[PDB]
Coordinates of C-alpha atoms and ligand atoms in Angstrom, one line a residue:
Chain A
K1 CA -19.5 -34.9 -5.4
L2 CA -22.8 -35.8 -7.3
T3 CA -25.7 -33.9 -7.8
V4 CA -29.1 -35.3 -8.8
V5 CA -30.5 -33.4 -11.1
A6 CA -34.8 -33.5 -10.6
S7 CA -36.9 -31.5 -13.2
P8 CA -40.7 -31.4 -12.3
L9 CA -41.1 -31.2 -15.9
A10 CA -39.3 -34.0 -17.4
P11 CA -40.9 -37.6 -16.5
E12 CA -40.0 -38.0 -13.1
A13 CA -37.1 -41.4 -12.0
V14 CA -39.1 -43.3 -10.6
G15 CA -37.2 -46.1 -9.8
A16 CA -32.9 -46.4 -9.4
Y17 CA -32.4 -43.2 -11.7
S18 CA -32.1 -39.7 -12.0
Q19 CA -32.6 -37.9 -15.1
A20 CA -29.2 -36.4 -15.1
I21 CA -26.4 -36.4 -12.9
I22 CA -23.7 -33.5 -12.2
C23 CA -20.2 -34.6 -11.9
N24 CA -17.3 -32.4 -12.5
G25 CA -18.6 -29.9 -14.1
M26 CA -20.6 -32.4 -16.5
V27 CA -24.2 -33.4 -16.9
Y28 CA -24.7 -37.0 -17.3
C29 CA -28.4 -37.3 -18.3
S30 CA -30.3 -40.4 -18.7
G31 CA -32.1 -42.0 -21.8
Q32 CA -35.2 -40.0 -22.4
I33 CA -38.1 -41.3 -24.2
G34 CA -41.3 -39.9 -25.3
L35 CA -43.4 -39.4 -22.2
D36 CA -45.2 -36.5 -20.9
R37 CA -44.2 -36.0 -17.2
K38 CA -48.1 -34.9 -17.0
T39 CA -49.3 -37.7 -18.2
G40 CA -46.7 -40.6 -17.0
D41 CA -47.6 -41.9 -20.7
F42 CA -46.0 -41.2 -24.2
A43 CA -46.7 -37.9 -26.0
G44 CA -48.2 -40.0 -28.4
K45 CA -48.1 -42.8 -30.6
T46 CA -46.0 -41.8 -33.5
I47 CA -42.3 -40.8 -33.8
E48 CA -42.9 -37.8 -34.5
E49 CA -44.5 -37.1 -31.3
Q50 CA -42.2 -38.9 -29.2
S51 CA -39.1 -37.6 -30.8
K52 CA -40.2 -34.0 -29.8
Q53 CA -41.1 -35.1 -26.3
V54 CA -38.1 -36.8 -26.4
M55 CA -36.1 -33.5 -27.3
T56 CA -38.3 -31.5 -25.0
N57 CA -37.4 -33.5 -21.8
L58 CA -33.8 -33.4 -22.5
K59 CA -34.2 -29.7 -22.6
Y60 CA -36.2 -29.7 -19.4
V61 CA -33.4 -31.9 -17.8
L62 CA -30.4 -30.1 -19.3
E63 CA -31.7 -26.6 -18.4
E64 CA -32.9 -28.0 -14.8
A65 CA -29.2 -29.2 -14.3
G66 CA -27.7 -25.5 -15.0
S67 CA -27.0 -26.9 -18.5
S68 CA -28.6 -26.2 -22.0
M69 CA -28.7 -27.3 -25.5
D70 CA -25.9 -25.5 -26.9
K71 CA -24.0 -27.2 -23.8
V72 CA -24.4 -31.1 -24.7
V73 CA -21.2 -32.2 -26.0
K74 CA -22.5 -35.9 -27.0
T75 CA -25.7 -37.8 -27.7
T76 CA -26.7 -41.1 -28.0
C77 CA -30.0 -41.8 -30.3
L78 CA -31.9 -45.2 -29.8
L79 CA -34.6 -45.9 -32.1
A80 CA -37.6 -48.6 -32.3
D81 CA -37.2 -48.9 -36.0
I82 CA -33.9 -47.8 -38.1
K83 CA -36.8 -46.7 -40.8
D84 CA -37.3 -43.4 -37.9
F85 CA -34.2 -41.9 -38.5
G86 CA -34.7 -39.1 -41.2
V87 CA -37.6 -37.8 -39.1
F88 CA -36.2 -38.7 -36.0
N89 CA -33.3 -36.9 -37.3
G90 CA -35.6 -33.6 -38.5
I91 CA -36.5 -33.2 -35.5
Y92 CA -33.6 -33.7 -33.5
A93 CA -31.7 -31.0 -35.2
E94 CA -34.6 -28.4 -34.5
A95 CA -34.4 -29.2 -31.2
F96 CA -30.3 -28.6 -31.1
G97 CA -30.6 -25.9 -34.0
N98 CA -27.0 -24.7 -34.5
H99 CA -25.6 -26.6 -32.0
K100 CA -24.3 -29.9 -33.1
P101 CA -23.2 -32.2 -30.6
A102 CA -21.4 -35.8 -31.4
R103 CA -23.7 -38.2 -31.3
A104 CA -24.4 -42.2 -31.9
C105 CA -26.9 -43.5 -33.6
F106 CA -28.8 -47.0 -34.2
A107 CA -31.8 -48.9 -33.6
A108 CA -32.3 -51.2 -30.5
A109 CA -34.3 -54.9 -30.7
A110 CA -36.8 -52.5 -28.5
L111 CA -37.0 -50.0 -26.3
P112 CA -38.8 -49.5 -22.9
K113 CA -42.4 -48.9 -22.6
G114 CA -42.5 -50.3 -26.5
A115 CA -40.9 -46.8 -27.1
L116 CA -40.1 -45.4 -30.4
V117 CA -37.2 -43.2 -29.8
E118 CA -34.9 -43.2 -26.8
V119 CA -32.1 -40.0 -26.3
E120 CA -29.5 -39.8 -23.6
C121 CA -26.5 -36.9 -23.8
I122 CA -23.5 -35.5 -21.8
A123 CA -23.6 -31.9 -21.7
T124 CA -21.3 -29.5 -19.6
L125 CA -22.1 -26.7 -17.0
Chain B
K1 CA -3.3 -40.2 -17.9
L2 CA -5.1 -43.5 -18.2
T3 CA -4.9 -45.7 -15.1
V4 CA -5.8 -49.6 -16.0
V5 CA -8.3 -51.1 -14.0
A6 CA -8.3 -54.6 -13.1
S7 CA -10.1 -56.3 -10.5
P8 CA -8.9 -59.9 -9.9
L9 CA -12.9 -60.6 -8.7
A10 CA -14.5 -59.5 -12.0
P11 CA -13.9 -61.3 -15.3
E12 CA -10.6 -61.1 -16.6
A13 CA -10.0 -58.6 -19.3
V14 CA -8.6 -61.2 -21.8
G15 CA -8.9 -59.2 -24.9
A16 CA -8.1 -55.8 -26.5
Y17 CA -10.4 -54.0 -23.0
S18 CA -9.8 -53.2 -19.9
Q19 CA -12.5 -53.9 -16.6
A20 CA -12.1 -49.9 -16.6
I21 CA -9.9 -46.9 -17.2
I22 CA -10.2 -44.3 -14.8
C23 CA -8.9 -40.5 -16.3
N24 CA -9.4 -37.0 -15.2
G25 CA -11.1 -38.2 -12.1
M26 CA -13.7 -40.7 -13.7
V27 CA -13.8 -44.1 -14.0
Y28 CA -15.3 -45.5 -17.7
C29 CA -15.9 -48.9 -16.8
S30 CA -16.9 -51.8 -20.0
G31 CA -20.1 -53.3 -20.2
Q32 CA -20.1 -56.1 -17.8
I33 CA -21.5 -59.2 -18.7
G34 CA -22.9 -62.0 -16.3
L35 CA -19.7 -64.0 -15.9
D36 CA -18.6 -65.5 -13.0
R37 CA -14.9 -65.1 -12.6
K38 CA -14.9 -67.5 -10.1
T39 CA -17.5 -70.1 -12.5
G40 CA -15.3 -68.5 -15.6
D41 CA -18.9 -69.2 -16.9
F42 CA -22.3 -67.3 -17.0
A43 CA -23.6 -66.9 -13.3
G44 CA -26.6 -68.7 -15.1
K45 CA -28.8 -68.6 -18.1
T46 CA -31.7 -66.7 -16.3
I47 CA -31.7 -62.9 -16.5
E48 CA -32.2 -62.6 -12.7
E49 CA -28.8 -64.4 -12.3
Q50 CA -26.8 -62.9 -14.9
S51 CA -28.1 -59.6 -14.2
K52 CA -27.0 -60.1 -10.3
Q53 CA -23.4 -60.8 -11.5
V54 CA -23.2 -58.3 -14.3
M55 CA -24.0 -56.0 -11.0
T56 CA -21.8 -57.5 -8.6
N57 CA -19.4 -57.0 -11.2
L58 CA -19.5 -53.6 -11.8
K59 CA -19.2 -53.3 -8.0
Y60 CA -16.0 -55.4 -8.3
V61 CA -14.6 -53.3 -11.0
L62 CA -15.7 -49.5 -8.9
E63 CA -13.8 -50.4 -5.6
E64 CA -10.6 -51.6 -7.6
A65 CA -10.9 -48.3 -9.5
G66 CA -11.1 -46.3 -6.1
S67 CA -14.9 -45.6 -6.7
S68 CA -18.2 -47.5 -5.2
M69 CA -21.5 -47.7 -6.5
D70 CA -22.7 -44.7 -5.1
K71 CA -20.2 -42.6 -7.1
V72 CA -21.7 -44.0 -10.6
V73 CA -22.9 -41.1 -12.2
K74 CA -24.4 -42.7 -15.4
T75 CA -25.3 -46.5 -16.4
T76 CA -26.1 -48.1 -20.1
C77 CA -28.4 -51.3 -19.3
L78 CA -28.8 -54.0 -22.8
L79 CA -30.8 -56.5 -22.6
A80 CA -31.1 -59.2 -25.3
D81 CA -34.9 -59.1 -24.5
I82 CA -36.7 -56.4 -23.4
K83 CA -39.4 -58.5 -21.4
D84 CA -36.7 -58.7 -18.9
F85 CA -37.0 -55.0 -18.3
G86 CA -38.8 -54.7 -15.0
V87 CA -36.7 -57.7 -13.2
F88 CA -34.0 -56.3 -14.8
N89 CA -34.7 -52.9 -12.8
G90 CA -35.5 -54.8 -9.7
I91 CA -32.1 -56.4 -9.3
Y92 CA -30.6 -53.0 -10.4
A93 CA -32.0 -51.3 -7.7
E94 CA -31.2 -53.6 -5.2
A95 CA -28.0 -53.2 -6.5
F96 CA -27.5 -49.6 -6.3
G97 CA -29.4 -48.9 -3.2
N98 CA -30.2 -45.5 -2.6
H99 CA -28.0 -44.1 -5.1
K100 CA -29.7 -43.1 -8.2
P101 CA -27.4 -42.9 -11.2
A102 CA -28.2 -41.7 -14.2
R103 CA -29.8 -44.1 -16.7
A104 CA -30.1 -45.2 -20.5
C105 CA -31.9 -48.9 -21.1
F106 CA -32.2 -51.0 -24.5
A107 CA -32.7 -54.0 -25.8
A108 CA -29.8 -54.7 -28.1
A109 CA -30.1 -57.5 -30.9
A110 CA -27.8 -59.3 -29.1
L111 CA -24.8 -59.4 -26.8
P112 CA -21.6 -60.7 -26.5
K113 CA -21.4 -64.8 -26.0
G114 CA -25.5 -64.9 -25.8
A115 CA -25.4 -63.1 -23.1
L116 CA -29.1 -61.6 -21.7
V117 CA -27.7 -58.9 -20.6
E118 CA -24.7 -56.0 -20.3
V119 CA -24.3 -52.9 -18.2
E120 CA -21.7 -50.4 -18.4
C121 CA -20.9 -47.1 -16.3
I122 CA -18.9 -44.2 -15.8
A123 CA -18.4 -43.2 -12.0
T124 CA -16.6 -40.5 -10.1
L125 CA -13.7 -40.9 -7.8
Chain C
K1 CA -16.7 -24.4 -23.6
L2 CA -16.9 -26.5 -26.8
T3 CA -15.0 -27.2 -29.8
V4 CA -16.0 -28.9 -32.6
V5 CA -13.8 -31.5 -34.2
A6 CA -13.5 -31.7 -38.3
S7 CA -11.3 -34.0 -39.2
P8 CA -10.5 -33.2 -43.3
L9 CA -10.0 -37.1 -43.7
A10 CA -13.2 -38.3 -41.3
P11 CA -16.8 -38.8 -43.0
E12 CA -17.9 -35.0 -43.2
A13 CA -20.4 -33.9 -40.7
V14 CA -23.2 -33.0 -42.9
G15 CA -26.3 -32.6 -40.6
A16 CA -27.0 -31.8 -36.8
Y17 CA -23.5 -33.4 -35.9
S18 CA -20.0 -32.9 -35.2
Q19 CA -17.2 -36.2 -35.9
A20 CA -16.3 -35.2 -32.1
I21 CA -16.3 -32.8 -29.2
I22 CA -13.9 -31.4 -27.3
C23 CA -14.6 -30.5 -23.7
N24 CA -13.1 -30.3 -20.7
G25 CA -10.5 -31.8 -21.2
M26 CA -12.3 -34.7 -23.2
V27 CA -13.1 -35.8 -26.7
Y28 CA -16.4 -37.2 -27.1
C29 CA -16.4 -38.8 -30.7
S30 CA -19.6 -39.5 -33.0
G31 CA -20.2 -42.8 -33.8
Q32 CA -18.2 -43.5 -36.6
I33 CA -19.5 -45.8 -40.0
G34 CA -17.1 -47.5 -42.4
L35 CA -17.3 -44.6 -44.8
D36 CA -14.4 -43.5 -46.7
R37 CA -14.7 -39.9 -47.3
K38 CA -12.6 -40.2 -50.1
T39 CA -15.1 -42.7 -52.2
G40 CA -17.9 -41.2 -50.5
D41 CA -19.3 -44.5 -49.5
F42 CA -19.2 -47.2 -47.6
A43 CA -15.2 -48.6 -47.7
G44 CA -16.8 -52.3 -48.3
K45 CA -19.4 -54.4 -48.3
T46 CA -18.0 -57.0 -45.6
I47 CA -17.5 -56.2 -42.0
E48 CA -13.6 -56.2 -42.3
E49 CA -13.7 -53.3 -44.7
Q50 CA -15.8 -51.4 -43.1
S51 CA -14.7 -52.0 -39.7
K52 CA -11.0 -51.5 -41.0
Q53 CA -12.8 -47.6 -41.9
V54 CA -14.0 -47.4 -39.1
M55 CA -11.0 -47.6 -36.8
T56 CA -9.6 -45.2 -40.0
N57 CA -12.0 -42.9 -39.3
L58 CA -12.1 -42.7 -35.5
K59 CA -8.1 -42.0 -35.7
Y60 CA -8.8 -39.0 -38.0
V61 CA -11.2 -37.7 -35.5
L62 CA -9.4 -38.0 -32.6
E63 CA -5.7 -36.9 -33.9
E64 CA -7.6 -33.9 -35.5
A65 CA -9.1 -33.3 -31.7
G66 CA -5.4 -33.5 -30.6
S67 CA -5.9 -36.7 -29.4
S68 CA -4.9 -40.5 -30.6
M69 CA -6.4 -44.2 -29.7
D70 CA -3.6 -44.2 -27.0
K71 CA -5.6 -41.6 -25.2
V72 CA -9.0 -43.7 -25.7
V73 CA -10.5 -44.1 -22.3
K74 CA -14.0 -45.6 -23.2
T75 CA -15.5 -47.4 -26.5
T76 CA -19.2 -48.7 -27.9
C77 CA -18.8 -50.7 -30.3
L78 CA -21.9 -51.4 -32.3
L79 CA -22.5 -54.9 -34.7
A80 CA -25.2 -55.6 -37.1
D81 CA -24.9 -58.9 -36.8
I82 CA -23.3 -60.0 -33.3
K83 CA -21.5 -63.4 -35.5
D84 CA -19.3 -60.3 -36.9
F85 CA -17.5 -60.1 -33.2
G86 CA -14.8 -62.3 -33.4
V87 CA -13.8 -60.7 -36.4
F88 CA -14.4 -57.1 -36.0
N89 CA -12.5 -57.5 -32.5
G90 CA -9.6 -58.9 -34.4
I91 CA -9.4 -55.5 -36.4
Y92 CA -10.1 -53.4 -33.3
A93 CA -7.0 -54.7 -31.5
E94 CA -5.3 -54.3 -34.5
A95 CA -6.1 -50.3 -34.5
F96 CA -5.6 -50.0 -30.7
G97 CA -2.4 -51.5 -30.5
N98 CA -2.0 -52.7 -27.1
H99 CA -3.8 -49.5 -25.6
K100 CA -6.8 -51.6 -24.2
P101 CA -10.0 -48.8 -23.1
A102 CA -13.0 -49.6 -21.4
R103 CA -15.1 -51.2 -23.7
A104 CA -19.1 -52.1 -24.7
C105 CA -20.1 -54.0 -27.2
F106 CA -23.4 -55.1 -28.9
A107 CA -25.5 -55.7 -32.1
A108 CA -28.0 -53.3 -32.5
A109 CA -31.3 -54.3 -34.9
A110 CA -29.7 -51.7 -37.0
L111 CA -27.5 -49.0 -38.2
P112 CA -27.4 -45.8 -39.9
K113 CA -27.5 -46.6 -43.6
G114 CA -27.5 -50.0 -43.5
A115 CA -23.7 -50.5 -41.8
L116 CA -22.6 -53.0 -40.5
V117 CA -20.2 -51.7 -37.4
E118 CA -20.3 -48.2 -35.2
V119 CA -17.7 -47.2 -33.3
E120 CA -17.9 -44.1 -30.6
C121 CA -15.2 -43.4 -28.2
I122 CA -14.0 -41.0 -25.7
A123 CA -10.6 -40.2 -25.2
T124 CA -8.5 -37.8 -23.4
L125 CA -6.4 -34.7 -24.8
Ligands
LIG201 CL1 -2.5 -45.1 -34.2

């Protein structure tokens, strides 16, 4: 049995997607890019703004799901530019605090909407 | 307990891979590319054609596993070119209908066999 | 309830990630690169050495988790260069033996630290 996570705070899943799906006690979150739900646009043009927003979006989704950042078992972090890794990293760290989920990281050729960064994750209830 | 999913409709797993593995109530499907088991080749040379074939392939694999498109919790959609994003999404949505899995989307530098699109997923039984 | 996996034989999880996380009967392992913990650097400058070191590293994590390659349900294998596919593949197959996980494959634009190959997986306990 599957349950859709629709936070009113994270970017609205307008297509054939959902922000996340809860199943068998896990929350599977879509790949957040750095949009602001309130604008339907990027929080800003920099890796710094989009990374914060992305991490904020994941938080929103997770929290709507009944999960939390502390319960994220695994992320995949995708970058427009490998050169943005450390800055993204610093922000990712800050967003996760003491919690250190498993992680996969790479640079994509490009990301949806010319996005500089995308983060997905699997978390637990 | 891992159970191997081998659908005779989906491209054959001639490798060190299985089409999908079932474990603890969940189906972990490999990244499908647009190969048509019937032609033994890419369904066509077009993003549109490969995409259909990819989604259909996943369908075969899922149903073979005892799952279905409606029970897909999460997909990752990989493109050789980001400009194919909207066209991809349309063909994607048609395939899933009213079901809205979680999703992550990006453009890879390249895909195996020159493939224009690759899609993987996790689903439940 | 999440268990942090830390093998002293896989590359140290230095920064806001853990080699792997155990949750609800599954082990979600970070994307490994071909670092040799013993040398503090890439096993080698070629795909072959790094791929070997990547598959070694994963064994370590998985084993440390209480898992094993046998128990991997799904891997993601990421190439810096799509043409290392053949060569990598044979290495991967060797490490996994007769076990055939679900799999996804692609070439990233770039990988952490100029790595030529990264492999993540999920496995059962
Ligand atoms: Cl082994």
